[PDB]
Structures are given as C-alpha cells and as structure tokens.
C-alpha cells in the first residue's frame, strides 16, 4: 500500500527503503537496487510524458474572488488599527509600546 515519495526514496532520513536494504542485507543489495531504479524510472516516465505549461499556473476563478475579499478585509483592518493608534485609542499590547 501507499505510493513512494521523498520520505521513502530520497536522501532525507531513515525509513528509506535503500537504508533498510543496507542495514538488513548488505551494501551490495542497496547498490544494485539503486541502479535498477535509475534504469527503470526513465523508461516509464520519458514515454508517459510529463510537462509544465502556463496553463498550470494561470489563476482560477473563485480564487480571484477569495483574494479580493481577503485583501479588502485585511486593508480595512489595518486602517482601523492605524485609526486607533493616531487618536490614542489603540490599546497598548503589554509587550511593547504602541509602534
């Protein structure tokens, strides 16, 4: 079960499958498995095809509305904080002075 990713093939940490091979069965087995993967993965991927394009980074529709609403809310909140400060109404957070 599962799918292989950096935590199980990459040079991050233990639980790496090559680490298990090295520790339980020897250096030669790990060195062989690495080359087998290096020869097998390209044959699959280069014939499957995998690409990145501008369509993959163009923003969606609902994202625009969400960003617009978030920007308006944040700017309004900042304006109210500055309003509170400049009139002295702003409550001083008990770790530093108003600025």
């Amino acid at each position: 079960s599962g799918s292989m990713d950096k935590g199980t093939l990459g040079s991050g940490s233990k639980n790496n499958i090559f680490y298990i091979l090295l520790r339980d069965w020897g250096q030669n087995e790990a060195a062989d498995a690495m080359s087998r993967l290096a020869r097998l993965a390209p044959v699959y991927l280069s014939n499957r095809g995998f690409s990145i394009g501008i369509g993959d980074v163009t923003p969606g529709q609902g994202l625009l509305k969400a960003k617009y609403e978030l920007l308006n809310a944040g700017y309004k909140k900042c304006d109210e904080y500055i309003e509170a400060l400049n009139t002295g109404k702003l409550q001083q957070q008990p770790g530093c002075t108003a600025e």
Binding site: L45, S46, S51
Partner: peptide, 9 residues
C-alpha cells in the same frame, strides 16, 4: 524547445 522529462540524461 519542448518542455518535458526525457531519457534521464
């Protein structure tokens, strides 16, 4: 140019 993974070289 074609933007794709190919041959692992």
């Amino acid at each position: 140019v074609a933007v794709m993974s190919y041959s692992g070289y």
